Design a protein around this ligand. Structure first.
Ligand code: NI
Length: 52
């Protein structure tokens, strides 16, 4: 229940799912994501992500 969103394009991330774009398992936390990880939609850095 931490579904965040991008502050550039708007790509609701799923922590309970992960992220194949880069390679993440379900039940993971964004913060857990790598630094080289970025909104795989626009580009914005993970630093531009917040929990709405
Ligand atoms: Ni974005």
């Amino acid at each position: 229940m931490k579904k965040y969103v991008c502050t550039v394009c708007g790509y609701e991330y799923d922590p309970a799912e992960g992220d194949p774009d880069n390679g993440v398992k379900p039940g993971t936390s964004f913060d857990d994501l790598p630094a080289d990880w970025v909104c795989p939609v626009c580009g914005a850095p993970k630093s531009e992500f917040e929990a709405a």
